[model samples]
Each structure stands twice: as C-alpha cells, then as structure tokens.
Target chain A: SGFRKMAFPSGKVEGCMVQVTCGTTTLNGLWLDDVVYCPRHVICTSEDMLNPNYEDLLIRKSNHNFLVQAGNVQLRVIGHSMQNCVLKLKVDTANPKTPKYKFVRIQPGQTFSVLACYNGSPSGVYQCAMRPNFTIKGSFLNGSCGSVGFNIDYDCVSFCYMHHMELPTGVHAGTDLEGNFYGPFVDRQTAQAAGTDTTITVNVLAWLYAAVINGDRWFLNRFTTTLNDFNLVAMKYNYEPLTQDHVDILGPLSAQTGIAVLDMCASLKELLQNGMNGRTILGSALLEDEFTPFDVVRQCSGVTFQ
Target chain B: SGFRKMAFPSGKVEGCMVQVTCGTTTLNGLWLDDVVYCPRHVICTSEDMLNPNYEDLLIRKSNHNFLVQAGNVQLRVIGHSMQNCVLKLKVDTANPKTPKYKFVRIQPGQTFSVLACYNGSPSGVYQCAMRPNFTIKGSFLNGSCGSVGFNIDYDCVSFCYMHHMELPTGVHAGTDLEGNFYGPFVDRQTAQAAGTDTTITVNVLAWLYAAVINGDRWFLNRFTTTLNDFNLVAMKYNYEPLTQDHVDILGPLSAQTGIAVLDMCASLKELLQNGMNGRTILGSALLEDEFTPFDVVRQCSGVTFQ
Candidate 1:
C-alpha cells in the first residue's frame, strides 16, 4: 500500500543541497546513518520515511559512502567468514562455470576489509554476454591480509544479480544494485538485453534520462547513444523548454537533479509519466527506430551509476 | 496619443472573481460604483481613465451631468438648429439622406441632463446596415453642457453607438451598447457579425464570450460555453484541449483576463504581457488571436474616449 505526499523525502535532499557528507566507510568510530528508499522511491535517512516497507538496506561495504562522519564507503569488519569469503558478482548468460575472479586476505577477527579491483586479461576466451564497454570482462583478483579468493562476476551488459534502486535526485550508495547495478530498463523479450521500442513509449524519456545522467562528454564524444549531436534534440522535438508542451511533459513527469547539472540536458525531462507507465528517451527513440539512449548506456565507459 | 500600463485599471478588477461593485448611475448623489464582469471583465467610474490626446475629434458639451439617469432613449427638447442633426450609421451598406429621429427635453443650464434609453417600434424603412440584432435604428439627440455633447464616431462594430468603453475587464456602465457589451475575439472570415463558428474551435471560445455578454436565453440555456457543453468544443476542432493538438493552438495564443475589457477592438495589449490570449471546472477553454492587451483601447469603442 502506498500513500505518498510526494517530494517529501526529496525535500530532505534539499538540506543536502550543500553536501550530504561522508563518503568513506569508518563505521562504528564515525559511523554514518543509513538512508532508506521507500517502495514509492522516496529517499531519506530519517524515520519519516517509515510509511512503507523500505530498504534501510544499510551499506554493508563501499567503494563510496555517504560519510565516515558524513558517510563514507569504507569497511571495518569485526567478524570473520566461515567461507574465507571475498566480494562476488555474476552475469546473465552462462555465468560462474567460468567466472571473473578475485582474492582477499583477513584475520579471523579482522576489523578492516577495504575492497580494491585489479582486473586481469584471460588468456582463454569466453565470448562476453554483455556490452564489452560497460561489461567487466577483466577486473581485480588480489588480497592484502590473509584470505584469498575470487570476485568473478561484474559489470556485464547482459544482466546483474543486484536490483538498481530508482532514486533519481539524491545520494548514490556504495552498495546499490548490491554493488552490481544494471539498467535504465530491460527488453521484456530478452532478459539479457536493454528494453526497446517494445517496452513502452514513455520509457524513452527514461532512456534520455540515463543519457543525461550518463553525462555530457559520453554523449558528445559519441561514446553513448545514437544522437550525433545535442542540437538535434530541439530539431527532433520542436519544443521550447518552458512552453506548454514542455510543461505538460515535465509537469507530470516532475523533474530531478543532483549536485551537478548540465547547461542543456539538465533542463530536459528524460522520463515522463503517461498514466502509471514510464516512457524513456530510449523507448521513444526506439519508436522512431533511431539513435537511442539505451544503446549508449549499454556501451558507456564512464562513471557507473546515475 | 495614449500611454497605458495595461490592465492596471483592470487589475483592480482582480478581486472581482466574485464581484466588483454596484452599477446603475443613480447619480443624484451617494451612487454606487459599477461592477460588471467577473474575472473576465469589470467596470467602475473614476478619473483614472485619462491620458489620451483624446477624442482627437470632439463635440464638446459634457462634464455637466446626468438627470436623466433613469435609463431613457427619448429626447423632448425644442429649438435645435445645428447640422440638421440626423441619425445615421454605416455597417452593411450606404447612406442616411433620410433619418432615425427622436426628441429631447433638456434644459440649457440644467448641467445634469443624463439620458438613458427607454427601443421603440419604427414605422419607417431603413435597411439597417449591420447585424440586425446590433443596429439601433433610433436613439436620443440632444444637450451641450460644459465638457461635451454627443461625440459619436467611435468603437464601431458597425452597429449602435452605446459608447462601449474598451476596458478589458471591470464594471459595465449604464449604457455600454444597451448594457450588452462583448468580446475577448472573432474568427474574421465570418460576416461583419461577431464571428461565430456557428461550433468548438478557438473561435467558438470567442463566440462563447459573446454569448455570455449577449445573454441570449437561447445560449444561456444550454449553448453557453461550459465544461459540460464545451467539451464538445474539442470534438469540433478535431483536437482535444489538453491534448497535443490543443497545446499546439493555445500554446502560441497566450490569452488572459482583467479588470475591464475592448470595443473598437485594437491591437491593444490589454493586461497580459507574454502574448495574445481561461478556466472552467471540467477543464478550461482558451482562445488566442494576436489581438493583445496592448491593442484594445488604443483604437476604441463608440466614444473614442477610451
């Protein structure tokens, strides 16, 4: 059951307009509070977010954190693993039989466990299931203390085991997507691919969103979507930003932003709400059968999460 | 020869969403002000309406007064010898070698000879040159006080001369076209008549406005543009109001409302700034023709004084 007085949590994010502090994991000493995203997708660390079952899903470990004092993504383990464990991940097609690997070292009662990646090339061949660019074909396999093991599956364009939380305008977690996030969306026909025109028209806005979130350089350098250039967006849509069409769209879709913003793309509403459905820029592009946001994110080589 | 901070007079008409003030010029003394249209139009009497090099043409005889406020169209005066004063107007066709006559009984120094219409039956024939429903075959002819005397050649909709004060919103005076003022547009292609689609186009919206002012029981019955009935408006335009097509039209036609409104309809910008441009319960109906708030009074109504 959902009863949302929307933008409430996003309001808290407003106080974070300056900075939501702490990105390193120094748990217990200068331990950071947990931020939970509600089922409706509201984001906040406060108890006010309790109206729904949520993901107080604390960050177990982090490559990044909200704060050590402010929230950091470092790990300080007070216990040990019976499996002599190391962080692990997997993909969509033919995973684990031949997996990406890793190794870790720690004492029985070790308190410090900082994960690092050092990908290596396999002399043997395993046709990659996902986009090679976004896909983690060759990543870390090492140890600092005593434990040594492998972190085989990661960054596969095909799929991920972790679920990507839909929080557009706030903090990013070190453990989101269970530390292995994937997608703006997926092709319903193929669990192994990003969704296309077949998904829904509205989602194309989401695809455009991912592109915007994907960043300008990636989009401009021709590293992302099919758009040869940004100007075509206007030519393509024939809309002036604040016009009624713009309002009709962004109005219902609402809008989002984090700390940084682009001069142009930031003003664009990549996601639109058509009733209960979401239309993405990518989805809409597929409708035109032209360059799409999906193609770009799938092959992107830049920062990971939006 | 005029400078206007448009709708400023009309803006006062803002509080008139519900009402403005009293009408009827009971000028014997403690008379009430006039409150005409709701948010759509308004009316009142104040000296604030000045600034035009004005009536660049004048008959010179008013600022005297009104007695004569009981609403009479009759004149019983003796000894008039100026210009053989004959009643004439041009709308549908030519001339007035013959005339529409009336008598008046006004005192020379009485200073308060206000006359009101009291439409009579005509035995003569004069193929009236305008909208039959609009043309006045006969009206009063008299008086020359201090400031003025019948300054008639203005705000012509090719009909009667009721001095339609081109204010975009506010109270309607005692005799602004038989207290049957109109406006906000017309599609033009129609006859010199107030262009009516005869149906839901934007022009229909203008038609609706006229109907409201026209107060014809036929229209007020079920024809008056309303959300229930007006929804059919889109069906006629072959486009929905909030739909893309609707946005396509109303988008560019930025319309608005004010304290008072127009007569010799001009390009007067009225009170709205953005461009040339309402709301109802089921939804809203908007009309946008370039005739802006900046245009109205600049040209003017029956008396050019506006």
Candidate 2:
C-alpha cells in the first residue's frame, strides 16, 4: 500500500515546522484533538508474527501545541500501527495551574499529527509506563489509547527534558575520546577477549589496544610512539621483522595481541628522546628553556593516565 | 614614488620571461623556472608591525616541471651593477638521494601565487636570508621584491618548534588515597593545604576531609552534619543547652580546626570516656553513621595514645 502523509505546525514561536506521514489503512473515527499524552521510546520496533516480518514503527505525525511555560519539550512517539496517519492541531491556554493540553486521537486506518512548540527552556524529566491509567472508558487500551495496543511488558521510557545537568563529568565534556569510551570497541574480538578478564585496566596501553584493534593508524602511531619513534616498538619484540610477507603475519598477530605497527615510530622516538635528554636535535638545536622531566612525562602519558 | 604593478602569468613552463614597465621607471628582474620554498613559521602575529617586509629583489616563477639537479649552482649576471643586486632564488635540489622541494616564497609588494597542482608532496623547507650575510640590496623599491628588502629588518624572528616525547611512570598513574598514599597534588600549595605536614598525623579525619573536598554531595552532607553534633556535645559540658546559633557557630569552626578541636580540655574528658567506653552519645541520630570511636582509635591511635 502507498504511504499516507501528515503535517504538524511547530508550537514554538518562530520555530521550524515539521510534517509526518504514515502507511496504514485501519485509522478512522480518531479525533485529532482527543489524544493527550505521547510517551517516549528509546527503542521502538514491531514484528508481525503471522506474516513473519519485522520492521521499525514510527509515529507518523504528532499534532499538538507546545506551551511556552512547558520549556524545551520534545514529543517522540514510536508505535507499529502509526505508520500512516495525519492529525489535526489546536491550542488551548485555559488552565492557569494545570493546563489541559489535547492531542489527536489515533484510529486504526487514519494518521495523527501533533505540533511540538519548545521555547528552549529547562523542563523537568518525564517517565511514563507504556500504560498509564485514564478514568475515561474506551480512552486507552492496556496503557495507550488508539487503534494500536500498548506493550505492557515493555520497560518505562525516560525522557530527559531538562537542559543542564552538571555538564556530565568525564569525557562527555567535549573530549574527543567520548564516543570511543561509550561506543563498541573498534576490534570486536580483542574487546570480547578482554571482557573475559576480571579486571580491565584502562590506561594508555589499553587505549592503544583499542586503537590497534580498530585499525586507527593515526591514533595508533601517535598513541604508542614517542616523538623519536613512530613505530610500535612495544609490539615489535613480539613479531618478526616487517617484510612484505610479514604484513599478513602481523594482521592476525595484531588481532590476537591487540597491537598494530606504525612506520612513524622511529621519528617520534628520536624526537622524544632528544627532548628528554637535553640534547638539541632537530631544527637548529633550539632547546626549550622550560624543559623538564615532568614535561617529558606528560607527553608520554595516555588518555587514561591523564 | 608610485608602486609598480607587475602581473605574472598563472601557468608557465620552464623558460625565461621579461617585463619592462615604462612609467616612473622601476628596475625589475624576473627569475624564471624557479621553485620557492618557505618553512612553517613557529610564531605568527595578527598585527602588521611584527611582519617581515622584503622589497622587489627578484621575481622567480616556475612551471610544475622545474627541477634542480645540483646543490651548488651559480647564476652569472652580465649587468653593470649586478654585484649590488642580490641573487634571490637559490635552487638546491643537489642531493638526488633526498630532494628538498620548495613550496612557497613571498617578497614585499610582489605577490607569489602557488598553483594548487603541486601540493602534498615531499617539499623542501625554504630558508630566506639577506645576501652579504645580513645586508639587503634590491630594485623597484615599491614593488614586491623592494618591499621584501624593507621588511628584512623585522624578519629576524624567533622560532620554537615542539617535538613529541614519551611519558614516565608515577607521573601519569594516580595512587589510591586510603592506602597510606596521600596525593598527586600538582603543586605544593594544594599538598600543604591538604594537611600533609610531618607533625600533622593522618587519621579517619582525613576521610572527612576527603569526603568534604572530594566525595560527592551525599558524603559531604554526612561529614558536615557529623561535625555539627560533635560541636554540640562540647557545649553540653558547659551546662548550657545547645541552641541553633551555637551549633551553627561550631559547625564551620570544627571544619577549620580539623582534628585539633577533638583534644579540647573539656571536650577531651567526655571524648575519652565516651570514645573509649563505646558510649559516645550525641543529640542527633543522624550523626550515628558517621561516628565510630573504635574506628577513630584505630586510625588515630599513633597520634593520640602513642
């Protein structure tokens, strides 16, 4: 069947508006202004067992006005049956304390859209069970009200509506390695093997391990080699001399040993040793007056050490 | 005198080119098929005063195919005042084993345009110096080559390039504080202020200090409140009911005095009896978790009873 489309004007004053479309035919008798709350889903997927098919479900269009007082709010809905629906929109400023906001009612064969207006204010957190109780009969099925039923077995989704939360300590503070810290290892096999150990030491060596496993040539060189040597001397003793034939040998060894070789290591090591030994080496032998063992130490320390 | 404007062709093969502008006569010579080399600047200034200015000396233009074979190549000039004029472009592609390719060169008033075709190859570092060691001589004073002469005085700039190095042990790895390991304080002020003096004994009080300064809010709150009750008990010996003001006054004072306040004459008597007998009683039950006379003795026994 062809996909249906819907549009929702952003509730934000001077904000970008969005339109959504769904692909389903069972939505009908759904009132646009009757639905109230839309829950958040971290992971939303659906499977049709009778057809033996699985697909991601998306709420086609959310049609609701965001309150200026509600702060920066994001409304996200994930459902299998909301594939093709167009919703209506309206605004109500009636209640001074607990204002009653309305959302479009979703039926089996129709689409629903909601306008999300956010003024970039800090809104508190919101956690909703897949099913919340409503006094009105026929309003909700299990925990959701609409053509599609709610998943009572699903875990509650938490929406972090607030903005600043202590800037999130550690690498989350604009550190380049933040993604690697949280994401899957570049080398799956080594990471899995390391996981078997009772203790995982997070150090420069570990970071280099990750870099080598992931085949990050630049990082592997810079992380492992000193200023004088850019080669992987730490792993050099473990492998045979590098030859055209040895290239293939190193790959499996690197996979098993979690160390990659780099050509720039020699230069990096030479530069580093010259800096440390107070020997004026490259570029007219201009030695740094503020040179200290501490500076040398800092240069060699890796991310975990830092 | 007005400036002489000379336009060099964008792309030219290895050959000689001549130019003679008639108005307000300026003596200009162009060096053809030459490679320009300049090293990366160690220091740069956004202002004009610190910038290098070299006037019209010689104009050298090379096509993408120009090559130099020898290290010491001499230019024979037949002009009458050729000795006074400096030979601007020095091509030293001498060592075929390691060819140094010059990338870019600029003289005052004269513009040197680099075609993008010759980028990212092994280019040689260019050295610019005054002929006759430090004396400048050139023609067309207002032209790019002439301006290069004027800027020569300001060109004696310093360069400091940094090379990479390796890190040492203990400098990067941090130690646990509880295992008789005190600090990795970067400076003496932080070390001294943290009470690491020889006479000052380590105790469980270090834990309170660590909690107040290092631990999160939960530990800080318990540490603060525990100190508050410890102060109130001291007032009880004076036969005065501890008021909110007294508790407030002693709370901050206890943190300031640290463990010294535990040895107060009146407080010492009660502290010894209650602390030794395992019956230390305070007005608030909130202080129970933080107070442990036995643990305190185990930590501070060397300083007190020894």
Candidate 3:
C-alpha cells in the first residue's frame, strides 16, 4: 500500500500565495513544487485542482529556509515527497514580482509525499510515486535510503493487448461457422493422400471430420456420405501456396459442399446464407441442385486460420 | 433638360456577366427600363408628378459607370451642385438578356426630386424640388454601382448634408449640462490689447468671427449677443490634436461639469450649484425651457451658402 497527502498553507502567508513541493526522494534533492494563491475564506488547493481529494495528498515543511520575504509579505513552503531524498518548498512573493519556488529536504522511514484535498475542498486525487533512498529518518546523519511508490491508480497500466477482429468495410462472416461440427466421414485412402501435399487440400468428407472438432454446423449440413468419401481421398496431397491448379480442384469441391448445405438448410427450414435477409428460395434451390457435390465439400471444410 | 437611357443585362449573357456602359455625364445619363423587372408597370412621369405620381429616385453613378444587371441593385452617384433635379421614368423589358428602355421624360418645366427615408428604404413620392445633378438609385442595378441615398416622403430631401459640429464631447448647450461650457462673451478690449502686442492677434479674431458665421459656435456664442443676451451662450470646443494647454483648460472643465451634473442629479430638490443644472440656462425661461437654446441657434442661423 502507498500513502498520499496534500499540502496547504498552515498560517497566514502575507500575499496569500504559498509554494508546495512533493516527490518520492529526500526533501533535500528530488521534488517538484507548485505555487498557488489563496483567497480569504476560499479554498485554494481544491479549487485549483478541481477535485475533492486534494488535502489527502499534501505534506507540509516547517523550515524558514524555504520562505521568501518581500515588502512585509512572506511565502511559506508546503510540499511532499518520498523519504530519504532531497525535496524543498519555497515561495517568493516580493522582489522579483512573480511567484517562484524551490524544494529542500526529506525524512527517512517516512515517505516524502504530498497531500491532495488537504482541506476537504473539491479537488481531484493525485499521488506522486518517489524513490525512498533519499528520505530523512531519525536524524539527518542517521537517515537510511530506500525506494518509495505513490498511489497513482489511473496511471498504472497499458491497455493494448485485447483481442479484436479487423474487418474491411462491407464484408461479414457467419458467427456459427467459427466453431466445431461433425460431418460426412471419409475412407482410409483419402486420409493418406492428405499428408502428401504441402498445401493440405480437404474435401467435404475431410472437412466434415475437421468441422466435428471445430463445431461449425452452418456449413456442415451440406455433405453427403459418398461425396465426403471421394473428397477425403483427393485432399491427401499438398500444394505450395495453393496454386491455380490446386484451387481448380478445390473450388469444385467447396461448391458442392456449399450446395449440399443449402439443400439441408432448405429441408430443415433454416437459412443457408446464415440469416441473409435478401436470400431467395429460388436462388437456394438452384444452388442445391447445380452444385450439390461442391456444397457438400463446403459443409465439411472449415476456414483456415493463419 | 437632359435625356438619355442606359441598359444592362439582367442575367448571364453568353455565359459571361453582362456589363452596362454609359457616357461620362452621370447626372443626366441613365433611367431604369420600367420600375425595373416590375412587369406590366407603366412609367411614372412628371406629368403624373402631381396625383398618382410614383417613381424611383435615380441614385448617383459611382466612379464606375452606372450599370444594372441581374436583379434589382443599388446605384449611387454624387454631384457638384446636386440640389433639386427632376427624375423622369421609363422601362424596357423586351429582351430577357438586354432589356430595351423607353424614356417617360418629364416636362421640361416640371421640378421633382426624391427624398431619403429614415429606415433607409426608398419611398414612392415625387416632390417639386429638382433631383440632384447625380443620383444614387439602389436595388435595381444588381449592385452595378454603390448606393448613397435612400428615398423618403415627397417633402424630404434626397441627401442630408453632413453636419460637422465644432464643439467638443460633453460640451453641448442642451439641458444635459454634464458637459464643458466655454464662454458667454469674448472681450474685444482684451483682444485689441493682444493685437497691439502681436501682429496676427487682430487677424485671429477676424478669422474667428468668420468661423462663427461659418457655424463655429465657439466664437459665435462668446462674442455675439445672439447667444449671450439670449442666455444661449455655450460652446463645446474639441481639439483634434489636443495640446498641453487644451488638457489644462478643457480636462478639468469637463470633469467639473460632469461632477456638478452628477451632484445635481443626486440631490434634485437641493437646488445646489445655483439651483440650476450643471449646464447653463439658455433662451428665455418663459419659453417653457422645454427646448434647448442650442436648437434655437441652429434654427435661427440657416446654413451659410459657402
């Protein structure tokens, strides 16, 4: 767990302006300070931060070294950081005209941190994570060094690894076709040839086997047992990069599979085009008869994943 | 006693914007072909100058030639001595591209002029005053030329002279006395004494007197009984390039007058500052004090003929 705090002006700062510094190291070396002007009876830190958690994240300093005086006006230092590191907070309200600041010390065992929403005014929460090695502890000479971390919930993670599909405009795929399905079985001869080709070519019968494991029913219903057996026998050969010669043989086989699926879907009163609103029964009927074998092949095969 | 007509294409001519050309004498140069695009309308002539007299004022031709193309547009022209010039009417709409024009010439003896309206719209009335040497007809020329004057009732003048007041700001002699006041009477004796001391002193007063006649109220109100005895002596003098002396004199004077007015307004019944408003009492108190004496001076002294 990490601790957080907000710093604010503790006493009357003549010009109503003060400097607050915070970091994760000893106050003497590493820290960042911000200057702010406070109005009478009106909260400054929370208003400036625009959040209610301002005070819970500030740390105040009690040294005059961080104080600046000009024209009867004084600016006090208020800051926070991790312990064992150098951090200082100083405010200048006079001579040079505009506001200025610096940071100086940090204590050990205790983290040098700043508070936010210090006065319970509305301000957003902010925590600075600092290394603890420079923090002041016990006494200036005996302080030990260590690393420190601050509570920064919103800044902790990278969000780029979520799974998403890249689809070009105007293209869509059936969701049911993505998983497993059982299909028409093949003979032993086709299974042996499947291993011979560099590009594995599968027929309706082989696709049916693959689909059974993949759970894709949308295309699986098209295969007939006989067509599946013949396709299984042809798919054993492989071709590199699937040349036109290979596609020529594969195309017809897939068409027959698709046709078979259409016929089955028509018989079952289901949409073969996976709920395509524009699909016509006449078109499906023609597809069922003219490409029965190819349809069967399509029903048995599954899409390849690269 | 001049007659001429100019025509312009209302729409595109041969795929190019049409331009109308006329002679240099813009004064007696052009007339609209009909109330322009007003179909079936008869031209208004000086003959109808009395009853049922309706005609648009002829705006002056600008540095560019007066031209009317497309829809109605505004036209403007200035004259050397453009006071009371009669405007005749005419129309021609035979050609959709370039319309023909007929001059409904006014009688040579008739005197008619147009007036400018308050809302800047052109009024339909013909009066006995002659039109200006140059006219600025608007909304009928398709923006061929710039427009200068608007039409008004028959009695109103076509162009109101630009009145230049010599008085300074907050220096009106009106009931609003919260302005600077200059003088009731200029001392001629002192002026003469200054004249002996300086060669240009006497000439300065003489020039000042001339300026007064020329509507310089600063000198008029201070030296003339017309303003002093009438209790109408107040002048606002503004220096375009103000000098140190002007600031010393006018600044405090203006300030004091404003303060006095404010004070009087604050305590209305108190009759503070001589029981009068910060401004001087002008004209006769018996005249109901309803009108300011400045207005009286303006009325009494007609503009100089220059």
Order the candidates by TM-score, highest first. Answer: 2, 1, 3
lDDT of 2 by residue, A1-306 (tens): 000011111111111111121222111111122221211111111232112111232333333222111223333322223211212223332222221222222111111111111122101111111101110111111111112111111121111111100111101000011111111212111112112111111122222332333233332234343422222442333211223333342344345544543333333334334432322221112211111122212222210110
List, residue by residue over A159-262, the lDDT tens digit for candidate 1: 11211121221111111212323333321111243221122222233234444542322222212222223334534453222333322443222344232222
Measured with DockQ on alpha carbons, how good is candidate 1? 0.00
Score chain B of each candidate by TM-score. Answer: 0.18, 0.12, 0.18
User: Model-by-model lDDT, in order?
Assistant: 0.20, 0.21, 0.21
Tell me which of candidates 1 and 3 scores higher on lDDT: 3
DockQ of each: 0.00, 0.02, 0.00
TM-score of 1: 0.15
**What CA RMSD would candidate 2 show?**
27.6
Candidate 2 structure quality by residue, lDDT tens digits, B34-130: 4221211101112311332212212122221122222223333222111212223334322222212122222111112111111111000111122
- Regions more than 4 Å wrong, model 2: A1-62, A65-205, A208-306, B1-306
Model 1 lDDT, residue A171, Cα: 13
Predict model 1's lDDT versus the native: 0.20
Instruction: For each candidate, report what fraction of the true interface contacts it reproduces.
Output: 0.00, 0.00, 0.00
